[PDB]
């Protein structure tokens, strides 16, 4: 059933699993027409498919051409997500195929279940966790490859950089969710915290800065402070 606070350690066991987040698949800018009506213009999107144990990210870029001449795009976006996840699973060797796929939004359950009928032993699960994966497009290198794409493309990343050399998957996932929660709550402030010291850089092959263990504690503290402040404002408490 549903993935929640109670079964959280399950994410870091040895059963292959993927999170799928469809938030950034169908992206639009809303604008006025010459006649003063409203129209949308689609921009490039992405499916965020993540192995929480290994940090392997399967970033399927959704080029605006896939929406051309289609109707009901927010509905189609769920089915296109389930089509691409199904295609990714079939592309993996049997021993690399997930045993579970956790969708961050319940509207993805039926589309994914129908696309995965050929894989009756892969469990499709919702979650009660409010995961901040929508903020993936606040990671500059992920935003850059999505916006530059001129055709459908899959790009592979490790969203944990080299952190697993020094910390457990549980701790790496907690750090990622904290960074993405900060980026989602106040992007400008989060990005200032991550780059303020120019001597700490991002390796060419990494997404995040090359913090020492001690610098990560300071950073993680700064992100927690950012999130609580913003929360006091949101709610006047």
């Amino acid at each position: 059933g549903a993935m929640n606070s109670s079964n959280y350690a399950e994410l870091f066991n040895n059963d292959i699993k993927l999170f799928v987040d469809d938030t950034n698949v169908y992206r639009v800018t809303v604008h006025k027409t010459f006649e003063g009506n409203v129209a949308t213009k689609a921009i490039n999107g992405c499916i965020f498919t993540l192995n929480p144990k290994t940090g392997h990210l399967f970033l399927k870029i959704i080029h605006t051409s896939v929406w051309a001449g289609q109707k009901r795009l927010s509905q189609l976006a769920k089915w296109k997500t389930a089509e691409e996840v199904s295609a990714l699973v079939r592309s993996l060797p049997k021993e690399e195929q997930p045993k579970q796929i956790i969708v961050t939004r319940k509207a993805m359950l039926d589309p994914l279940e129908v696309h995965m009928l050929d894989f009756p032993n892969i469990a499709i699960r919702p979650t009660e966790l409010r995961l901040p994966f929508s903020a993936a497009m606040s990671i500059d290198k992920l935003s850059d490859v999505v916006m530059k794409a001129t055709e459908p493309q899959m790009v592979l990343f490790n969203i944990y950089d080299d952190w697993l050399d020094r910390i457990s998957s549980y701790t790496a996932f907690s750090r990622l969710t904290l960074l993405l929660r900060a980026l989602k709550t106040n992007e400008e402030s989060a990005k200032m915290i991550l780059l303020s010291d120019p001597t700490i850089t991002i390796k060419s092959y990494h997404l995040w800065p090359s913090f020492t263990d001690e610098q990560w504690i300071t950073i993680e503290s700064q992100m927690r402070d950012l999130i609580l402040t913003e929360y006091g404002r949101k709610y006047n408490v």
Binding site: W79, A82, P111, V114, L117
Partner: protein, 300 residues
């Protein structure tokens, strides 16, 4: 006009014959039901006064043989049996009629209710859903499970309704996942109508039989089957015009006949709301929408 004699009535029981019912007292000199209209299937059903659990009964057609009821004190139920000796049977029925020991099937001349509920129901189709090939009549009760309920446990005592499953390889063509899920026309028209049922008459017959087992026995798997067969039509954008008009008449008489006090357990809120207000066929069931809105506005 045919007759189902009873050897006796040793236990107090409510006896149903189609949509009618009569209370019989323990050892009341009751010897059966006469004037049963030829041309239709019929159901004769029982609810014991001492155990209002296990409604049970028999589907039959008097054109297929001479049938009677006899209480079995070992198995503790009223059993249907066939009398193969035509002359013995005619002599039993004539005697009980002369002694006026039989209730008359109480059909009003104007009243097409039973025809309207059984229009497509054939005894030969019932005998494929309810498998007991040595009898010409079919036993059903409150507790019998469906082949589909058993997949999710005694196969001999199952209702072999046609399995309908919207999230199945049968229902969804590879490469048409979204199309086939959101528009079930290929599942209805190619797989079910052309493939399995062969025609709309057999599909309607199974739908009508599922409803009657739900209503008369509170059979939960039958209720599931009735709703699935409605939902498969209503969720299809492309349905022959004669099938929609016929479905509206079928459902109208089913909703008309349903006891008002059983709407809460016999009608699925989600299916009826989806079918009448969201589905492709939301505007195709005028009679059904009107009787539902006037009789069960709470459900909607």
């Amino acid at each position: 006009m045919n007759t189902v004699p009873f050897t006796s009535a040793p236990i107090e029981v409510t006896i149903g014959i189609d949509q009618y019912s009569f209370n019989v007292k323990e050892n009341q000199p009751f010897h059966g039901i006469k004037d049963i209209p030829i041309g239709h299937v019929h159901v004769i059903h029982f609810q014991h006064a001492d155990n209002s659990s296990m409604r049970y009964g028999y589907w039959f057609d008097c054109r297929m043989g001479n049938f009677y009821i006899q209480y079995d004190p070992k198995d503790g139920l009223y059993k249907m049996m066939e009398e193969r000796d035509g002359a013995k049977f005619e002599n039993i029925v004539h005697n009980f009629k002369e002694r006026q020991m039989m209730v008359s099937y109480p059909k009003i001349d104007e009243d097409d209710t039973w025809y309207n509920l059984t229009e497509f129901v054939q005894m030969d189709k019932i005998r494929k859903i309810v498998r007991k090939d040595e009898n010409q009549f079919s036993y059903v009760d409150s507790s019998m499970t469906t082949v589909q309920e058993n997949e999710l446990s005694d196969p001999a005592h199952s209702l072999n309704y046609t399995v309908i499953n919207f999230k199945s390889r049968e229902a969804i063509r590879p490469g048409h996942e979204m199309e086939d899920f959101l528009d079930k026309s290929y599942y209805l028209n190619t797989v079910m109508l052309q493939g399995i049922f062969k025609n709309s008459s057999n599909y309607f017959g199974e739908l009508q039989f599922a409803f009657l087992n739900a209503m008369f026995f509170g059979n939960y798997g039958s209720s599931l089957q009735w709703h699935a067969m409605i939902e498969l039509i209503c969720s299809s954008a492309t349905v022959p015009k004669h099938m929609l008009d016929k479905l509206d008449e079928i459902l109208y008489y089913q909703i008309k006949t349903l006891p008002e006090q059983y709407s809460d357990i016999l009608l699925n809120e989600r299916v009826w709301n989806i079918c009448l207000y969201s589905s492709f066929q939301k505007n195709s069931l005028h009679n059904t929408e009107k009787i539902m809105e006037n009789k069960y506005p709470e459900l909607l």
